[PDB]
């Protein structure tokens, strides 16, 4: 582990210090279909004419990014994503920009969002959930060792690849920070009490989010849900959680430790770091090495009717890609 991380960090820093840029053009691709939508732009299934390969191209309207004051978070996303490298992290193939947009070409993960499958099937069996959880556990061990904080873990941001494994996508709020940060961001249901209470936080919020995910995958619904966000935050800070009667005793224990309001006693944030999690009973049958290597059998394998298939994604209205004849927000995105 420690040996591994050490090398991973040296590779990350080389790219972190000298990120790549303008490694493609819009015309080197064929726009096929919208795979999802965001606030600054849509993610489109695209085809690299030269290689004939399929990619998920994330488009960001520079002006909208500026209106929402997401400039730094956006630069954070491209800078971090172009430098990391882990099995369960979607890879950024190319990145470029034009008069009005920023582009990030990622690998296309046909399997679809965990969200879709999870909502449809209702809930995952504990073993099934343990499978995905294990992957998130290692992915965070990786990310955090790089001084990175993901800040937006949720079913919507996890894709299932052809082998049935997880691919974390969307680093919109990822940040490289040693020490503590204060930005209020993330998704309501998954927010740590610290964030909601504007007290300054760290990686610990990623572990609390892990608890929320595991609970949602196991129960079929979040540990804290309501109709209005404010009602949700009230539930979160109350340090009161209810578990489905079917949750195993081990599972409930692991969750009581993750959804720990007291940063002094929250798994992942103790002297034993992540090991307090890896060595937890609920993960007894989990062979961590076997997971990182993708040797373990995937409990679910989304199949596709061929390359370019988008049957695992919802349908969105198709918006044309317009590019002003005038450069927009040039100085703000110079390093992109």
């Amino acid at each position: 582990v420690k040996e591994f991380l050490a090398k991973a960090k040296e590779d990350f820093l080389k790219k972190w210090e000298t990120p790549s840029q303008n490694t493609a053009q819009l015309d080197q691709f064929d726009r096929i279909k919208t795979l999802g939508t965001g606030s600054f732009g849509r993610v489109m299934l695209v085809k690299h004419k030269e290689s004939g390969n399929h990619y998920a191209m994330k488009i960001l309207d520079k002006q909208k990014v500026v209106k929402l004051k997401q400039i730094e978070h956006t630069l954070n996303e491209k800078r971090i994503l172009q430098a990391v490298n882990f099995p369960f992290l979607v890879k950024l193939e190319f990145s470029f920009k034009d008069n009005s947009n920023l582009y990030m070409v990622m690998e296309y993960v046909a399997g679809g969002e965990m969200f879709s499958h999870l909502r449809r099937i209702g809930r995952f069996s504990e073993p099934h959930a343990r499978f995905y959880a294990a992957q998130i556990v290692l992915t965070f061990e990786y990310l955090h060792s790089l001084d990175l904080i993901y800040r937006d873990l949720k079913p919507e941001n996890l894709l299932i690849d052809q082998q049935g494994y997880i691919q974390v996508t969307d680093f919109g709020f990822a940040k490289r920070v040693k020490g503590r940060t204060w930005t209020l961001c993330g998704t309501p249901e998954y927010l740590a009490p610290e964030i909601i209470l504007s007290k300054g936080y760290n990686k610990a919020v990623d572990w609390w989010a892990l608890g929320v995910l595991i609970y949602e995958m196991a129960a079929g619904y979040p540990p804290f849900f309501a109709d209005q966000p404010i009602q949700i935050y009230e539930k979160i800070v109350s340090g009161k959680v209810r578990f489905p009667s079917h949750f195993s005793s081990d599972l409930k224990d692991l969750l009581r430790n993750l959804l720990q309001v007291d940063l002094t006693k929250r798994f992942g944030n103790l002297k034993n770091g992540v090991n307090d999690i890896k060595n937890h009973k609920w993960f007894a049958t989990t062979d961590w090495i076997a997971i990182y290597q993708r040797k373990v059998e995937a409990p679910f394998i989304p199949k596709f009717k061929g390359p370019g298939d988008t049957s695992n994604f919802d349908d969105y209205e198709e918006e044309e890609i317009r590019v002003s004849i005038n450069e927009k927000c040039g100085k703000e995105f110079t390093e992109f």
Binding site: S39, F225, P229
Partner: peptide, 20 residues
């Protein structure tokens, strides 16, 4: 049931992030 309440809630669809 908890499940029922969730399914009848308005937050079963894709949830957006909060910038602010």
């Amino acid at each position: 049931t908890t499940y029922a309440d969730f399914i009848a809630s308005g937050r079963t669809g894709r949830r957006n992030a909060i910038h602010d």
